[PDB]
Amino acid sequence: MTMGCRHVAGIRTVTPSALGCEECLKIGSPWVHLRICRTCGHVGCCDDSPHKHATRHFHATGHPIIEGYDPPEGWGWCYVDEVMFDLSDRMTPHNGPIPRYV
Ligand SMILES: [Zn+2]
Ligand SMILES: [Zn+2]
């Protein structure tokens, strides 16, 4: 899909902390789509969502590469690069059934 930047060389297959955006789950609120780090395994709603968990989390932890978990297409977005590359065979397995609200 896209040439992976050096950041990709340090990402692995991780395990999600929840069945969706943990922050949204804390208040029982829906999400649009989910982005999980290929590092800490923590999930978050995209910046397309008004909650913006993935973006604030990125700034908080420094995890620039996220994967679409809610849409398990198998791609990795690197915030600092703005490039979306392929993770088709490395895609994170489901730890449960993700509640698609939207
Ligand atoms: Zn990068
Ligand atoms: Zn993270």
TrEMBL record:
Query: Which InterPro entries does its entry note?
Result: Znf_RING/FYVE/PHD, Znf_UBP
Q: Which PROSITE patterns match?
A: ZF_UBP
Record GO terms (molecular function) = zinc ion binding
**Locate the UBP-type domain: which residues?**
3-102
- Protein name per its UniProtKB record: UBP-type zinc finger domain-containing protein
**Upper taxonomic lineage:** Bacteria, Pseudomonadati, Pseudomonadota, Alphaproteobacteria, Hyphomicrobiales
